[model samples]
Target chain A: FGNKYIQQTKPLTLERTINLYPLTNYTFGTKEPLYEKDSSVAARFQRMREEFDKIGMRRTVEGVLIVHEHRLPHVLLLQLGTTFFKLPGGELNPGEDEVEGLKRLMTEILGRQDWVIDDCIGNWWRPNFEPPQYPYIPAHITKPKEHKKLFLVQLQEKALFAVPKNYKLVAAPLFELYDNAPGYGPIISSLPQLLSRFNFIYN
Target chain B: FGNKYIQQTKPLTLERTINLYPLTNYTFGTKEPLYEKDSSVAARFQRMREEFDKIGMRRTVEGVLIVHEHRLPHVLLLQLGTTFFKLPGGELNPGEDEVEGLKRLMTEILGRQDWVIDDCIGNWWRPNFEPPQYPYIPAHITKPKEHKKLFLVQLQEKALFAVPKNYKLVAAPLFELYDNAPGYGPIISSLPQLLSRFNFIYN
Candidate 1:
């Protein structure tokens, strides 16, 4: 016979989905400080340079965990200063799987390992070891400096998270990132557009 | 050396360029009306049934041609009514190449055959023989009824097109499609997200 799901009212759709429980469902507490591997500009570039020699293209991963507040989607962000904010993930070790590395980084940042990591939302590329990361490949440059992949981390109902003391975990609404390149940088700012495809259900 | 593009896109074979040229670069003129292969719903379902006998899984392809205006990208859509619009595309014949089929359908609709088509942005599937199509295959769905592939159609420098008289070719901005699923339908509305990764240029 024909497919079963196909026959069941069909109401099929074009988007993928991720569950977004209410913001109040998850509880958070501050934990011990978590620091970066280098945490120095000189050392960051030095490690980037040497690491590129070994791994060629440095692989980095970030997570876009979502929660609903007041009927809007809020992304879980790691804020370092009054002006600096970023996703809760970091560079993966050599030959590390992207999803697993993302899981490790999320646990390292959020101080928990129970959260289920989901699919990749998008990816970005930097050419020749610099800050600029574009969604599309720039026509000419062959040797890229680093590759940053973004993933969607899933939140189970009624979960608890321990935020790192050194960084503030904030839930930023989608509008704050939409077209706000100057505020969130190109990669972070473009989340609204990248996320527009999902059929987000606010529970 | 690393691949042409990096990250999860690294293992991917085709070059993924979401670069969009300025909308002012393209000009459209009128041409004779072009009609679908079949008009009646009865004929369509009948053909679909017979076609199913010929090709087990129906392969359909569509193209997303984009242009930039006012720092925002616009998608080229074929409008039949105030509320109905679609991409310039159609189903592929058995053993037809997806890219070539999309190019053929585009030319069939617009009366222009010179534009270059490449890079599948994303794909969707219909679990049954009905209307619903999804970005990812649904769980427990062993076989999908239809597989729809979407590609990015590229324009070189500047171009001219002969739009069919019966249909109005309109350039819809990204905002119109964003979060307006009730109007554009699920597949068309999700263009913003599937297209978010591209690095578009104003000119």
Candidate 2:
């Protein structure tokens, strides 16, 4: 089978996640202390698993390109998602430079191999907040300790569908909703604003 | 005699001026016929005369370097003052290539024989502001007919007051009651502010 882009429809754990999708959800179960004979090792294992299960494990970087149509000048905006466990100072892990990490993220999340990446946009810091009328939880229980750092990459060819399906867009994914719930924010993009400002004809 | 940097202490008028200073000032005098002659041409001649009085007439460009201490990461603002009679972005004169004009500007502006200009900062475009605040005139006046591409030369040094003379150690410029009312409408910069902002340590 040609490694077909995995459009994960089911709730796959981070390990199984492949290819981009519009939205994906991860759920964590609350830890409940239980008194049992073999509980010590189980407790240790659960703690380690919980730590790994934090949102940071699922966090990925996004690179957005903004082109001034008439001037043909390029501007970039990068953002880091806070819902996912936060990285310290928005730093990348060992052996993973920001550029390489961005490539890995684009390939794994966007599932597009042909696209080329360019210069950086910049990093951003976001604070976690609960939606005004949150249905289930009374308030935000966990807050991201770190902020998201977005690297803006300019592709040789513009891909309208560059964002893959599996990864959930945190904010207004499309023009479908004019108003967004408090908790959900849209992708911070300068492209649309640039387009309107310059009145560029986009294909 | 050593060239000493002097500050203007008295209001200078060309009609009564004695010293040949490197500064120019103009005021639109109220007249019945409004001085009928084209103000633009007259202003250009006045500025040229000022330049001649200050230094021998030569191809040159004058620029303003605005340092906003309040802004983080430090931003240097530049304003291109007219030395070229022919307007920028307008019809070119004989033997004048517009691109060469910019190059000439760079060379002459930085290649002053008296001082060796060092590269310390990068150039950046100021973000566009709305009509009321942008291009910096109140609503009564229309935007400039010609688009003047003002360029900025940023200093490489990042720390506050890279030069000892450029450091005013104070968090902000000092304020005092002087010729005009001390309490002003907005904090428009004065001579003292410029001196303090640029002069870090008094030698």
Candidate 3:
């Protein structure tokens, strides 16, 4: 379910950044109910309210997976209804490896048996246990309420993904997310910039 | 010196985004000193002081030219001595077209006959007369000191580039700029994420 390694490796190169495959390379199938915490948005945040006391700052990890279509690289996003979209990942346990914990969540969400978590794209922190999460910790704040991390999840040449029935796994073109804060929110909207440096080969 | 079209095009596709060639495929030659304003840092701000009264808010454009090496994408940056590293394009003349002005600046800096200014990676604002620049405008500051635009300068399959004699052009890997704030500054450092969405083909 996971490889919790920090992924120590040789120095960075084009091949090392990220690689994308044709959208057709992936085969999708439906799976049994894959729910954690709670389905409703309120319940999830409600649990976060209780969990924060039991644990500490909520540590969440999300994976940014890539696929190419029409000669463009699209982000593999999990969508619910017409309004919501997010990457594949979940909150890490009290003391869990960030990389491995992300893999564990990927399997729970996508029903994939294996994953290669590539690199840490970036991380954000909630300053006051509120909705506002910033790329940088504001000068005034000392302790953050939540720590959300993003990682580039690498995919194989070809693979099968069993998605849950309720969540629609959609390949979102970068243009769909660019400057679309009202639709995708700042964290998701900023992904285009957070992702721009890699050399992606659409095979 | 440039085409000032808004670049109306068909719906986005992977092929329409960007293409990369092996860093070795391109050629580089040195040219005459390509200087605009005064050379010293003090002179840059001094000119900005006078230009603001005459030319109005500074409108500057920088081109992010790309190449690949070691299966990785490298940004072709202009280096002055060991400390200063920047993109190729330069300031616009009063109300110059962004795309064409960037092309004009590219030709001035790189000595290339033709340039295809692709998508704009991002734009930034300089809030005050001093050096601080931010990705987004702060809520309180309505008028910014400068608007700096970043464009993706698309390269042909194979071409020759002649740099200026006083400046050295270098191919910097994505990793070199990733989180390298002290070295490349924020705008350049953020390029990896700004460029991550494109589907690159390393030939």
Candidate 4:
């Protein structure tokens, strides 16, 4: 009964593989420069790496996908699911494509279907984060380390639906005219990093 | 790489199972009534129901599941999802268990895993709404007609994360020895109706 004319679009970036930061990497504020000298973050990161190594987890390029619109920036932001593996995050499930994965993940978590599937936003690289050498378990462990990637898609509409309990998602309405609109947190957080890394902006 | 101690739970209710409306039919001031002798809500419902039926959507009954905590009303609210049926609304995947489906949905969409998992909640029926016959789509759908019974599950812990796009969800912390906090919303357009229908409170 809705827009029957809508169809899936090709992703801006396909499932290009990349290494993303672990859940432990995200903290309350931006990483301090002195973290480089203190090595505290690095120490924790090393500990986490070692722990994962014991469990056969290591730094590996899982997959990277992006979705961009002609009207928006080149990069996107993503979040993880409970089933997402922590070691390598969840791999693209055998031969599944990135767009399929994004749609699958989003729909699985949020009960809705009106989303524009697009490409990977940026190149695969180690995300900028100071991994503590003595990595303690994140206060929150519901997410995975590397499987998450951002995708940029244009919002043609707005609707309300429920998400599963205790799941994490990052999305913002790019079309909103106000800075303090209902859905800006994730967009604001990802855009600066994305702009600095990939030079593109929308009018 | 994660907490092995993490457990999973699935809650179901009879209302969901049978897809029946359980509570008494009531309407909020802002919400439209489901039925009126002069109105045409029932006719519209029949049309829409027919549409869903064409798409293989059928109303099936399951069972009732209720949540109870000594500190609060013996009830909870939850949503469901799975990897399949990426409709404008989310759905359970074929052959997927409810726990996995909920976990996948919650973690990926809600932004974190902050609730406890248990199997105590399941199998809910839809709520009963008086379907008023309408000449056109009314401003509000009626209760039993519009309301669906949801399986309830109380979280062991409340989750904190980003709200989804275009939706605003805010919780207030109770103060002054209230022992527990209770928050409502513009979302609660029919608190009195719900309380009276469900016998949820002495009021």
Candidate 5:
């Protein structure tokens, strides 16, 4: 027989999940051309891109950072198009370590390889079958699960560096991470707790 | 040359992790005697329990269930001591498959060996060095990293059975999981999203 403290309660039901609101204003980025070709060949390249998207070939590995200036801890956010602030970093190639892939992405994005990883913030798992919420994500890609590893990176130097034309880097105040609404909700929700574990403060 | 959109702003500092307030009313659990006591026999039992808590020895495989009745979904919660409600199930033995270990725990906990697993919910990682928050956890054991696997189980019959003394089973309302303040935070926070993936809901 169980103890006197045991009690039964009514069941609770849920409908929609916590939404990561969709991004509206955005443009996909492109790097160097794999091969220069004639107009006919170039038209077919678009089809190849579509095929890659359909098979779930895209896997992203992003880096999160805390930048210090004037004795304050600011988080690095990447701006795409005219609006939309996101955690800085990018996609991983096949079979790449999450942290190492993120380092490669930051080096490519910031044009500097001196960033040091302070700690693993945590992992956020997104089921792939859910509809793509962000504008830059291809609609056809919906099979491979998204495993995002958020890392706390320390920038060795604050000097400006070469960044790709389509992207913008913004070092927003730590408290402002959630001020920009309708962004990545999971990352925003997890940040305060993760930062606190490392004794980082927002004043 | 970096883009014009890249900008740096003020920074933020963080101090402490989200606190899981300490349990005020709790008594740790103990199983049967391992041996008849001489001083050496008692010490050997201590070593056995300590070894169970060591890094390689403390692998846990837990079962999380949604027991349905009259078309409504109810989640199972186990009460330890007088206050806390934890997800039903227990730990894995060395070299046991995650699901098999969970099945064994359920069989032992519910006095039923006919349970069937419906699906896996997800995994939540708890670092070993982090202070153990629950009261039922032994003070002498502190080395094993906790990797908990939450599994959804299907019962062969709806009949209720005996649970061990000091343990009470409650069919809690799903949405009210977080309302039970000062309880298991990680499991409560993770339930909705994890349950949604399987299309299980009460309306």
Candidate 6:
């Protein structure tokens, strides 16, 4: 709303990594009913409640694995209870950098601290209205203004961890996730198109 | 680099706004011979020197204006000395949020504190090797690890400010900037295509 418009007299060259995907089609949330019997669900909900109790609201940082073997690209997805699968990641501690927080979460989840974070693929906004489906979340605990930053992680060694009860790890092809197959989260469904724009090698 | 992969079991919908530009084509640098005669440049260099003197290296926050009038989108560019134009944002104070820092810079530049930051378009990584073109910058003061976060600012009223000596402001059409015309910075050259993906009204 200025009276005179301003223009630059010299060109400033900047490097940007662009991922070409339709913005309109991306959305974040789940439609399935919350299963209370699952240990992973209960554990996650307990952690969420504890976090909310300490801070009114906060943002969550998560890691999305792009693991591959024998030249086939696959992703890491986690199962909560008997049904419902989502990406592997967790919340960021207060005043934490997104990448650093994700690293910490990955270390705890995988029980190792040597994984290398390749790149930050993208982020997903979780609005306040879209609360966690679990009933264990306290009524006073409002859904905070949260967004999940997805990072591509590369494990230095074979992934080995004691799989938690109520939680199952599955490795699926990128194409299947792109097809919007059943049991895949919204973010996972869009990963194929998102990852296709970048050049990565699968071991 | 990992051996195994994982997949998700449930659909999680999330909203996203994708800007599909080539990564290799994106570059950041200045073509101007940094003129020591410009007061604005001297002032900026002086501040930068003082900051470096205080803190070894740090990041900077800045704003990029996308102003429109009469159904035409124009970008605000600034002139340093007789040649070289760039965006109109300055350094951020320690621990200050990018938006808040930008608002402060805008207030100082425009001499008014009544503008709103609509959104952050993206960030630019200015590595240490990309030193300021000006000779006034001390040789010892190497270019710090700096990244500028460009925000879309909306002026509450028509912009009014006393033009400083050795500085000039120009408003140029978006198309010309997009065409990579002479005398435009790298950011200006890319703004046309970058802003095209977003919807905004110039009041």
Top TM-score prediction, candidate number? 1
lDDT, residue B44, candidate 6:
56
What interface RMSD, in Å and to 1 decimal, does model 4 have? 23.5
In model 1, what is the error at residue A109, expressed in angstroms?
1.2
The estimated TM-scores of all candidates read 0.57, 0.32, 0.52, 0.22, 0.40, 0.38
Q: Give the per-residue lDDT of model 5 (tens digit) for B127-173.
A: 44453322112223344355555666654333455566666666654
Candidate 3 matches the true fold with a TM-score of 0.52
For candidate 1, write residues A1-203 as lDDT tens digits: 67565344311123355678988897789899877788887888898999888878888888888897766778888898787899988888887887778878777778645657545567677886567666534445567788777777778766788898898878888768765778888778767656654667767
- lDDT for each residue of candidate 3 in A1-203, tens digit (9 for 90 to 100): 58686866533422234678998999889987655557676886777678877887889999988888765668899887688888898889887988889989898888756798756666676787467776644445666778878888889989899899888899987768766879998778777666654556767
Docking class of 3: incorrect
Q: Candidate 4's chain A scores what TM-score?
A: 0.35
Question: Which candidate comes out best when scored by DockQ?
Answer: 1
For every candidate, what is the interface RMSD in angstroms?
9.6, 24.6, 12.1, 23.5, 16.4, 17.6
Error of 3 at B63 (Å): 0.8
Q: What is the lDDT of residue B68 in candidate 5?
A: 46
lDDT of 2 at A192: 23
- Quick one: RMSD of model 3? 16.9
CA lDDT, candidate 4, residue A26: 26
Let me know the DockQ for model 4: 0.01
Error of 2 at B48 (Å): 20
Interface DockQ of each model: 0.07, 0.03, 0.06, 0.01, 0.02, 0.02
Segments of candidate 2 deviating more than 4 angstroms: A1-61, A66-95, A125-150, A158-203, B1-72, B76-152, B156-203
Residue range B1-203, candidate 4, lDDT tens digits: 66576554311110112111222221112222112212466774565465444543223211122222221222212221221111011234445554455555454434424433332111111233333221111222222233111122223222343334433222211111111212322112111111111212211
Instruction: List model 6 lDDT by residue over B154-202, tens digit each.
Output: 5443445544445566666665664363557545554553443243443
| Model 6 stretches with alpha carbons more than 4 Å out | A1-203, B1-56, B131-144
**What are the Cα lDDT values of the candidates?**
0.74, 0.28, 0.76, 0.28, 0.48, 0.51
lDDT of 2 by residue, B46-150 (tens): 654554455532232222222233221111211122211111112223345334454454333222112112111111111222111111112223322222232
Ten residues in sequence with the least summed lDDT for candidate 6 chain A: A10-19
